[PDB]
Design a protein around this ligand. Structure first.
Ligand code: MET
Ligand code: MET
Ligand SMILES: [Cu+2]
Ligand SMILES: [Zn+2]
Ligand SMILES: [Zn+2]
Ligand SMILES: [Zn+2]
Lengths: 153, 153
């Protein structure tokens, strides 16, 4: 069993804690936790390529895309490795996150450790938005909060 | 040509940016950057095991010690992989960091990506302090600032 963790921080405050667990290196990653301080509704949720927060979340770069694919949703074959969909916030501005993903990993070439988890301003259209930007970013807008994914006990 | 980065922050005024570069698999890692808001003098400087900031720097756990050694200085055979010695701050409270180390790596089983870099309250005695804690923590005291080490562009 392999474990990772990420503390999300952004202005608001937007605060999040997200845990990752992978029982076996050829198996799925469960992702769970909570994010508070965001508006009710959908917020895009992705792994970005670099664990660089030197000048904020912008420093993380584009979606983690080791296989050079187009943007999609997590259930799509055509997706970036970092494409984890949306999290959904309630009227209290709390998003409870419960995901299982078979494409991210905590070891090997799809490893997300040392990269940045980002929660976005707007909904991710899952690449179904019918513009060029949909197939790159999902039209999810600015970066509300982020943190580097680290190895956990 | 492998690169990593770490943004150091804490509860108080301590802030830092530290860059890592490793030209060759199993070659030396160059570590450089700056830390401000610390007191004049020595501050212990180590990679801790976990990239976990859930409840701040304490969540990072002990020094990164995959080979089960005693605490030492970076120029010692007997050291933790995470043992990078001290940084030294001037009367300005600024520490300029310029380190080269052959024991840490940015790939493989000595890899520090996804782990935490910590700058301490006090000086690290490099395990020459002659008490038991010297051979464990170097007597460097509390954690003033820390960050998860991320993959950089
Ligand atoms: C079977 S437990 C629910 C799994 C959920 N996908 C998670 O984040 O862990
Ligand atoms: C030859 S350059 C000086 C090495 C120094 N240790 C560094 O971090 O780059
Ligand atoms: Cu994103
Ligand atoms: Zn994407
Ligand atoms: Zn320490
Ligand atoms: Zn040590």
């Amino acid at each position: 069993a392999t474990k990772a963790v990420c503390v999300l921080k952004g202005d608001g405050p937007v605060q999040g804690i997200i845990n990752f667990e992978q029982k076996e290196s050829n198996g799925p990653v469960k992702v769970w936790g909570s994010i508070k301080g965001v508006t009710e509704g959908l917020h895009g949720f992705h792994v970005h390529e670099f664990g660089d927060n030197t000048a904020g979340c912008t420093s993380a770069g584009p979606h983690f895309n080791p296989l050079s694919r187009k943007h999609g949703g997590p259930k799509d074959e055509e997706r970036h490795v970092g494409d984890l969909g949306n999290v959904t916030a309630d009227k209290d501005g709390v998003a409870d996150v419960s995901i299982e993903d078979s494409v991210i990993s905590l070891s090997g070439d799809h490893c997300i450790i040392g990269r940045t988890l980002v929660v976005h301003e707007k909904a991710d259209d899952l690449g179904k938005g019918g513009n060029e930007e949909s197939t790159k970013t999902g039209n999810a807008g600015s970066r509300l909060a982020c943190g580097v994914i680290g190895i956990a006990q």
